[PDB]
Amino acid sequence: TNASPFIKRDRMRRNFLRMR
Amino acid sequence: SLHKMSMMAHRVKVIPYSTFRLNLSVTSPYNADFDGDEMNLHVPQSEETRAELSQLCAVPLQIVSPQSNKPCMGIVQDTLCGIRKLTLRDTFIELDQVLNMLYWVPDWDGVIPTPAIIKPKPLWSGKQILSVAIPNGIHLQRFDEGTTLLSPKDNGMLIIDGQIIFGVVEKKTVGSSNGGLIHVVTREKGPQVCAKLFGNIQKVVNFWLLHNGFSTGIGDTIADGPTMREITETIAEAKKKVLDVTKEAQANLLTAKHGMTLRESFEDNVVRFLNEARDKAGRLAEVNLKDLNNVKQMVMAGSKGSFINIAQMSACVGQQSVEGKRIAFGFVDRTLPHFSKDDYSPESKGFVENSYLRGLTPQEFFFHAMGGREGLIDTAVKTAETGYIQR
């Protein structure tokens, strides 16, 4: 039951970059 | 400067590490915390001034406040909590500790009292050793609502010949109070022995706390599951009662209490119901609260805390207020643009439902801000006003 305790900027950057 | 105190003479022991340094006991009369306060000094020049300053403005002959005929002095937060911790029937202590803390008392008689118990090991009650710091020839009886001379609840306090007999030390007994111990010793023996008493008590209790240690945390606040569920249903039934009263009002039949207007009676009734809900919930949360809790210990021990504090942290806050009249309709027919118009439900018109533990909701947050702002501004004006009156 983490309920999103953390957020990462560079990981989201890379994930959406590979998504594009 | 406000009253005769905040003006006391002092002896000086010069210290490195440039700053001022003073005893915790005298904190309250100066009304000065350590949050970054600043403090003044004046040095006499002649001999007459020094003499009269020593004989009139010294602290030891300033213990009892003439303005309220009770001692303005008194031990404070840390040692108070600690001495409450020590003065419990369920505590004990070993040779190794007691030898040191006996040596800590400056005027210790150099005689060790016999252990209260011997069977496997000599031990001592906290009361037993603490009696040493008490000067001999003192007597005191309290008998507060329990105290059957064999006090099961251990409330009250009795001292014979400067030796504790039974009871738990409390701000109601050792703090600033009409029948306080400090009052008794000051009036009885001499208005400087009390200073040594302060020193001894502070020193020994601090030493014992050092090796005991005491703290608190989040787990202090969190409460039992089914109990907070009961809190929730109590809030719900209060809401149901409020809604029922509102329904009765909306059908034009009502008590219409003598004198005041229909709307006034409605507001009075709803406010009464909400306050009933809040304090009943707080009572339930408290009676839940475990006796091994730290914050409960702290609040019942005196110095800091309240029923209201734990209630607000654990169960509910209660509706914010703006000069009694609960939050009014800023916008037309509503208190906030997220609500339908013409609603009198407690949430619509600003009743804080949740508790600090879970955290508020945007609207409730705004209402809390309103209340805080009200308090801030009212004090920020009354200060200058009442200063003018005082002058």
Binding site: - | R11, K13, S18, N23, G36, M39, H42, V59, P60
Partner: protein
């Protein structure tokens, strides 16, 4: 009001304060810098001659 009933004075200081449970009521902790600066007059007696001489 600014000069007669209330005025600047001399032999004074002000700093920040902190607590200490090792110091009894009538005492107060003072930084040695102040003791260097703040002073107090004494008159020479046949009693304090030695101490004052050493102090000088």
């Amino acid at each position: 009001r600014g000069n007669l009933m209330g005025k600047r004075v001399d032999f004074s200081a002000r700093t920040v304060i902190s607590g200490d449970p090792n110091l009894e009521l009538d005492q107060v902790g003072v930084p040695k810098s102040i003791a260097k600066t703040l002073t107090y007059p004494e008159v020479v007696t046949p009693y304090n001659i030695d101490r004052l001489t050493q102090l000088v």
